[PDB]
Paper text:
Here we describe a series of structures of the E. coli clamp loader in the process of placing the clamp onto a p/t-junction.
Therefore, we designate these two states as the Semi-Open and the Fully-Open states, respectively. Unlike the Initial-Binding complex, in the Semi-Open state, all five subunits of the clamp loader contact the sliding clamp. These additional contacts between the clamp loader and sliding clamp help stabilize the initial opening of the sliding clamp in a spiral conformation. Interface contacts between the A and B AAA+ modules and the C and D AAA+ modules are strong, while contacts between the B and C AAA+ modules remain minimal. The AAA+ modules adopt a spiral matching the tight spiral of the clamp.
Residue numbers in the entry:
A (entry chain A): 1 to 333
B (entry chain G): 119 to 182
C (entry chain B): -2 to 368
D (entry chain E): -2 to 334
E (entry chain C): -2 to 367
F (entry chain D): -2 to 360
């Protein structure tokens, strides 16, 4: 079975088509781009009828025999699309897919979208019978190491001349989804049709991407800027950001910070920096985060964090924003 | 499983049973709080079969 | 006097021009250059907070996309194409409120419409507002009409709750997020509206209305309309107070002030007034401790106050200035102990009263008299 | 597992608890209080088998009949079980509602109408109050059963309708002998298992056959480095296995044994780690030790009660507070109110 | 035994003439002024604590709007529509249980039936009681009619907590608030009502019930009918007290005076004679706590004592002069804790006795010798 | 035949007339006088702890209210309506368990029902029990029918705790606080029942059973059934003592005298022995609390000795003499807080060990 990457699919589509297509991944930008690229390829090859189905646990046999009846002989050529459940194929569809694999014709072009599946799901017989006939596309979101390179290439296909500072800020503001990178790139291109992405131009927008959760709220505390993170929290409460998510971010990050604080007395800093495999761009702030905030500060911060999470959990919610900004104002000392 | 012996045995014309049920069926409770209402009472005495249905606002009695 | 009774400010002041839209310039410039250049997408979605502009920007986009002058970023607003929308009746524009339309039958009825050519305009516009109430099957139908849009088919979508939508619908459509209107933006737009209507007004009244509306400009206009009707066409901060401050909670500032200042008679009058309104005592103690914590923690950094305390800064700063942290810690200990002791007191009123008395007796500056 | 497992020391109790039903004087309800894995489940199962059996043999169930043949197939039309679904943890109003609405009909097989609640503490208080009427005044030939680790946590009303039968854990020597016959290792481990589990031999079996024992060993070793160095934070990895209640319980048991060692007591629970006990006594001050033990118990309670609480944050704060307390010059808390 | 009597004083003595609404002078003044001047808003929101008259005032205004013609300030004689309003025969008077119409579809159904004005009256009035429990979408649905309704339809919304419901609805037309009735007004109303029914009443009983009523005539009338039932058509002091269960406040006063005076034997005497009186120990502790809060109250102002406390005001003054505030707070803390653990004491009498004995042992001046 | 002619005492001895009710004269008198004089209220709210009689008083009130022989404070008990209401098969007394019928569908059903005529009795009465857990929507829908019902509608509310009621719901109904039954009343009713049913007993076991059940007659009868199930169908002091696992004053005083002198090793050995015998730990703590109370009484005034038993009162007198009041107060407070935290303790025995070892803190 041909496993491909989203950029390399087009060439394959030009060379020859496959009756069955699979789109596995979490990032939906490349999912939809690959889907409609294949669809326009089929339309360029005379495929007219395009059926899509949303397969859920509610979807069942009586939701699939119409599908089977569809692709026998109606007119010219047609295409089919499916939506898979969040956990991948189940036992209910394990037989439906086996039945669907029994009838493959050039009349119908089969398209399947979804996320990553368990290794026992492709181990099923229908997948093995579909190996030579189908092509799978990898559609996960890779790490941030290749993020600047990929976004620079993308902006080149979007005809945008980014600066190094513009690239840095756009990457740093949107490490969540290629949808965010897109919408930012098209917003910038439409605002400035020229294509030169100067840092003063790209910084304006509305704010640093969105009110986000982590980036500047945590970073200012890492460097100790009370005003910055405090205004960020004010904006977060203005837009009604979920306090539980903020607490989860603090829980996942301050624990790593505490791990970093230990061993610093009897081990050089950089050894601790690379022992945890923490990102170097993050290490550049972890340095002064450890230097400024002492062990007593860490203990007090974790204590108030536990008190806050407690009071929040049993449906009290006693001014969660006040205690969050209290955490911030402790971490700024 | 061993069948249960019957203490009330009889045989009826289909017309009689159909008339009784049509006479009282609309008169019995649905999911009502009083558990003993959601049903039909089949009284028998002498040579007469009587059928009673109620929902607290209605009553159908049919004797044949 | 009877101003706006004919046309509520929200309706009366619906922006017919891009210059009439205060704020959202990040979206306005993008829309203008997209219309002028021609980078028009098959679907546009906007995300905002109630009275943010979503219907306004959608209707303006309808004007600019199907005006008699052509696809123009600066609609005339006087042509037949523009005036049809301005009155509200445009044949090729279909405005739908999804709150009352969650069924699949009506969605399929519009699905059939997506195919025919526009009767009068260049393109058919299907504006669906507050789309988050659409059913799952209605969402699937919308996706099916998103994937294969005819040339004359443009979709404008808007909803106050954009994350309720499925992933596919968000992925298919280009999203613009309207920033919640700042208090200054609302105040400036309101001042311009009132000045253009030739009516007397007061500045602090506009500021209070903007603070009360909480970012929604349509709600702000409706609230100011209520003020105009109640004030008989006059905007007075007195009437503004009488309408919003009465429903708003204005307490524990006087309580904390008097308790720190050791005014027993004033705090007794304050507790009597609190009991008169029938308010909750545990919530009162929560408010007291919250204000006390804020006052204490402002001493850590002067920037600790956000715009949430717009009516408190004038008192908050002065109170936090003349106070020692040790006294605040003692007061907080007392109030926490009192809140713990509240449920077992004879009455929650009596309990909070006794806690206030315990605070007053242990007042460092003014200890309670003893015979 | 399959029909669970009978336990040898349970035979007396059942006999007594069947006499009250042989004479016909059996209270319809019954709130069996027994420790987890103690063996109350087998008792309830055997009782229900005797009750719904059409021909109740003397102290036995049937020997041969369909009435409990449908019981063995687990498909009797009167026998109802109330357990939370495998994917959930709270017993909803809906299941008790269905059972109680289907109780008002007659007995299908002409026998009794037996109900059973698998675990009463899991009953939502709304479900308890929906089941209150059914327990107080059931129809004729209707019986009930319930199982609780403790009765005091139950609703004030539900236990008031029921008889609070108690399952005494077997004598210490007998339990040790049974566990030795079942599991083979040093008696110190067995005594630790029984005393830790409050005497529940089934819970000792679960500790051994479960991985936790080795993990318990891990904790001991970790403390063997922590207390001599005042470095408790490194215990985090030991105390986070979705078993924070149980592991915190083991830690509190160790601290109890240390405080016992101060006021030198003949018997302590942890007998497999006497050196650890001595070290814990040596390094830690009694007031600090009691404050730390109180914090350990408090955190275990906070984790056990509120689901959805973050285990990592709680245990991290606990370890930081302990490290703070080992510093001289700290003021320790005292239980109050 | 059998009868056809009773009317439930709550169900009998509701205002229907604007002269029986006791207190709430603000709202009655506003309503009279508006009706006489012909200025009527499109939405009325009566708020306030429970048992005050918001529903009764709503009925009052509704029948004042539609009563054989005539824009009166409520007085309306031989008014048919009014008499069906007070008789439960709905005449353009639509009471709605908002909890049965929480969903937005139900309130949309409420909206679309707004045009049915001419039904043997001029205005059709809507009473969406407990309005604070509407859904947000339902709030928005009714808001459109709220801002500009038909002339003939008047909205009258009643709620307990105005904080809950959205601000926009709060601000729409009006928001009147009814304060809790004072025990003095409750006394007047109970005295007047029991006078109307040729039933004798001891003023001590009236004061007891007025204070036992949390400023709400419906609580006061329920308790008063309970008192009438407990006796035989007569309310008496001892029957009323045995009904409430509250002991002699003088018994508690002697107990706390003994606790101050550090005579444990007298404390035991008082506690055992109170036990023989069959009074609840929790009640004894809470009454002593009330007395302790009162003796702390007199430390700040002499007006702390209510009118009834004129019986024991002198002893209050003496204890206040004698005992410094720290000792009052010490006793209050001791007894408040004691009440907190009273449920866990081996016996309620045992726990109360131990708490008193502890307040004696931890006596600030003269503790129990070792 | 095999239909279990036997019924549990907790239900067989349910009150059947206003003269069969144990205690609560403060509410029986009011109810009977209201029945007789002609003042009957349309909503009665009986509230009290478990096993004190809210349901029974309400059912007797229903029996009286719709008896065909007028409306009397004394139901005849031989008529039809009395018989069905006693059996619970009457159409016009409808039992609603508020835990189930809390969704708006069921409340709407009830409000639909109240608009019609009765079937057999004068009054159609809804006995809603455990009302304090109707969802807020249910209560707000129920306000109208609880305030001004038709002529033949009366409501009887039974609640385990008034606190959870919306206070507005409290205000529209007539509150009856059923007092917890005193130990003397419980013991006398138990004596009358057991003599009536020809069951041998002795007063001591009755006093133990009354003490164990904290003022709940149903609880007293439950413990009676437990005490007769074990011990050859009779009530005896040894039987109830074993059933409760209670301990004599000697052992608890040994514990308190070892702990007051900081004899930690002796205290732990005593706890080990008590566990070996398998006592109930809450019983140990209540006995320690009682002994400390008696010691405090002796300290206050020498007249109130330990004379109920007066077996080892020498030890109590000596301990009072040799210990300041402050130390006894601290011991009581520590043991009491520990008692409060038994359920939260991982084990009962270890919770008591925590409490005792913490009491060992003073020197
Ligand atoms: N950005 C804005 N500029 C000018 N007026 C606005 C703006 N946002 C809201 N409004 C005012 O609110 C009224 C309704 O606006 P609308 O755009 O319909 O809000 P929505 O996002 O909730 O559909 C408009 O008539 C206009 O007066
Ligand atoms: N202001 C008042 N004037 C006269 N009677 C009142 C007043 N307030 C309450 N009541 C008495 O209480 C009964 C019920 O009052 P109601 O208005 O329902 O109080 P709520 O505000 O709690 O609904 C009335 O029948 C009346 O007897
Ligand atoms: N006042 C009482 N007089 C006599 N028996 C009582 C009394 N209260 C409770 N009981 C006993 O308790 C059993 C249950 O009483 P019940 O009235 O159901 O209490 P509840 O108020 O909790 O529903 C009765 O069967 C009766 O034996
Ligand atoms: F029109 Be908006 F969404 F309030
Ligand atoms: F409406 Be009230 F609170 F009785
Ligand atoms: F057991 Be009772 F109804 F409180
Ligand atoms: Mg809109
Ligand atoms: Mg009312
Ligand atoms: Mg009951
Ligand atoms: Zn135009
Ligand atoms: Zn069998
Ligand atoms: Zn009139
Ligand atoms: Zn009778």
């Amino acid at each position: 079975m041909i496993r491909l990457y989203p950029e390399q699919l087009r060439a394959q589509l030009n060379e020859g088509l496959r009756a069955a297509y699979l789109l596995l991944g979490n990032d939906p930008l490349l999912l939809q781009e690959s889907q409609d690229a294949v669809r326009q390829v089929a339309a360029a090859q005379g495929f007219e009828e395009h059926h899509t189905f949303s397969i859920d646990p509610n979807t069942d046999w009586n939701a699939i025999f119409s599908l089977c009846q569809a692709m026998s002989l109606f007119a010219s050529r047609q295409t089919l699309l499916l939506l898979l459940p969040e956990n991948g194929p189940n036992a209910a569809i394990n037989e439906q897919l086996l039945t669907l694999t029994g009838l493959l014709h050039d009349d119908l072009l089969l398209i399947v979208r979804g996320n990553k599946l368990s290794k026992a799901q492709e181990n099923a017989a229908w997948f093995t019978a579909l190996a030579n006939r189908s092509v799978q596309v990898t559609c996960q979101t890779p790490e941030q190491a290749q993020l600047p390179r990929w976004v620079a290439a993308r902006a080149k296909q979007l005809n945008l001349e980014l600066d190094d500072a513009a690239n840095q800020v756009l990457c740093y503001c949107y490490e969540g989804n290629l949808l965010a990178l897109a919408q930012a790139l098209e917003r910038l291109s439409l605002l400035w049709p020229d294509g030169k992405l100067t840092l003063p131009r790209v910084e304006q927008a509305v704010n640093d991407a969105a009110h986000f959760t982590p980036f500047h709220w945590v970073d200012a505390l890492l460097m100790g800027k009370s005003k910055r993170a405090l205004h960020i929290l004010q904006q977060l409460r203005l837009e009604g950001s979920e306090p539980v998510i903020l607490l989860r971010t603090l829980q996942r990050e301050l624990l790593l910070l505490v791990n970093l604080k230990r061993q610093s007395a009897h081990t050089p800093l950089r050894a601790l920096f690379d022992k945890h495999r923490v990102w170097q761009n993050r290490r550049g702030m972890m340095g002064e985060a450890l230097n400024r905030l002492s062990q007593t500060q860490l203990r007090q911060a974790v204590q108030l964090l536990t008190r806050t999470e407690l009071t929040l959990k049993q449906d009290y919610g006693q001014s969660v924003w006040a205690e969050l900004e209290g955490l911030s104002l402790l971490l700024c000392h | 499983l061993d069948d249960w012996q019957s203490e009330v045995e009889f045989t009826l014309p289909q017309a009689t049973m159909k008339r009784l049920i049509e006479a009282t069926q609309f008169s019995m409770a649905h999911q009502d709080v009083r558990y003993y209402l959601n049903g039909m009472l089949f009284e028998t005495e002498g040579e007469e079969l009587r059928t009673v249905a109620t929902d607290g606002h209605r009553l159908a009695v049919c004797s044949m | 006097g009877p101003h706006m009774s004919y046309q509520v400010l929200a309706r009366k002041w619906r922006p017919q021009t891009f210059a009439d839209v205060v704020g959202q310039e990040h979206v306005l410039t993008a829309l203008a250059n997209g219309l002028s250049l021609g980078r028009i997408h098959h679907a546009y979605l906007f995300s905002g907070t109630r009275g943010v502009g979503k219907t306004s920007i959608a209707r303006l986009l309808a004007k600019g996309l199907n005006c008699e002058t052509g696809i123009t970023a600066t609609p005339c607003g006087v042509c037949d194409n523009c005036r049809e929308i301005e009155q509200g009746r445009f044949v090729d524009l279909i405005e739908i409120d999804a709150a009352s339309r969650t069924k699949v039958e009506d969605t399929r009825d519009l699905l059939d419409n997506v195919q025919y050519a526009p009767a009068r305009g260049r393109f058919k516009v299907y504006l669906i507002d507050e789309v988050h109430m659409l059913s799952r099957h209605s969402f699937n139908a919308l996706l099916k009409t998103l994937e294969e849009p005819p040339e004359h088919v443009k979709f404008l979508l808007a909803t106050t709750d954009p994350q309720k939508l499925p992933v596919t619908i968000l992925s298919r459509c280009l999203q613009f997020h309207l920033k919640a209107l700042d208090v200054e933006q609302i105040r400036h737009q309101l001042e311009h509206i009132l000045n253009e209507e030739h009516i007397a007004h007061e500045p602090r009244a506009l500021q209070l209305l903007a603070r009360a509306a909480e970012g929604s400009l349509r709600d702000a206009l409706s609230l100011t309309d209520q003020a105009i009707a109640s004030g008989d066409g006059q905007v007075s901060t007195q009437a503004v107070s009488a309408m919003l401050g009465t429903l708003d909670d204005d307490q524990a500032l006087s309580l904390v002030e008097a308790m720190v200042e050791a005014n027993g008679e004033r705090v007794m009058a304050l507790i009597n007034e609190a009991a008169a309104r029938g308010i909750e005592w545990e919530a009162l103690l929560v408010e007291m401790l919250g204000l006390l914590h804020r006052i204490a923690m402002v001493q850590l950094s002067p920037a600790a106050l956000g715009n949430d305390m717009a009516a408190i800064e004038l008192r908050m700063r002065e109170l936090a200035r003349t106070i020692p942290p040790t006294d605040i810690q003692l007061y907080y200990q007392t109030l926490l102990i009192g809140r713990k002791e509240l449920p077992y007191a004879p009455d929650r009123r009596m309990g909070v009263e006794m806690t206030l008395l315990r605070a007053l007796a242990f007042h460092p500056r003014m200890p309670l008299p003893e015979p | 597992g399959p029909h669970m497992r009978w336990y040898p020391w349970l035979r007396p109790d059942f006999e007594k608890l069947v006499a009250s039903y042989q004479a016909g004087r059996g209270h319809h309800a019954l709130l069996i209080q027994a420790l987890p894995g103690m063996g109350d489940d087998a008792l309830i199962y055997a009782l229900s088998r005797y009750l719904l059996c059409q021909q109740p043999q003397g102290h036995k169930s049937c020997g041969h009949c369909r009435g409990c043949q449908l019981m063995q197939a687990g498909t009797h039309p009167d026998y109802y079980t109330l357990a939370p679904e495998k994917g959930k943890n709270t017993l909803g109003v809906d299941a008790v509602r269905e059972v109680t609405e289907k109780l008002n009909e007659h007995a299908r097989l002409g026998g009794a109408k037996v109900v059973w609640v698998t675990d009463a503490a899991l009953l939502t208080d709304a479900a308890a109050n929906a089941l209150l009427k059914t327990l107080e005044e059931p129809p004729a030939e209707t019986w009930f059963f319930l199982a609780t680790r403790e009765p005091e946590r139950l609703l004030a009303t539900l236990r008031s309708r029921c008889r609070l039968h108690y399952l005494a854990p077997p004598p210490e020597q007998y339990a040790v002998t049974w566990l030795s016959r079942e599991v083979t290792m040093s008696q110190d481990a067995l005594l630790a298992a029984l005393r830790l589990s409050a005497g529940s031999p089934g819970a000792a079996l679960a500790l051994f056959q479960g991985d936790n024992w080795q993990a318990r060993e891990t904790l001991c070793q970790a403390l063997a480095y922590s207390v001599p160095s005042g470095d408790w934070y490194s215990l985090l990895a030991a105390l986070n296995h979705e078993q924070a209640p149980a592991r915190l319980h083991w830690l509190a048991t160790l601290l109890m044994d240390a405080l016992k060692r101060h006021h030198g007591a003949a018997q302590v629970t942890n007998v497999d780690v006497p050196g650890l006990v001595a070290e814990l006594a040596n390094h830690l001050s009694p007031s600090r030790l009691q404050a730390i033990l109180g914090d350990v118990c408090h955190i275990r309670e906070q984790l056990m009660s509120v689901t959805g609480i973050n285990r990592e944050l709680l245990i991290t704060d606990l370890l930081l507070r302990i490290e703070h307390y080992l510093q001289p010059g700290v003021v320790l808390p005292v239980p109050h109110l």
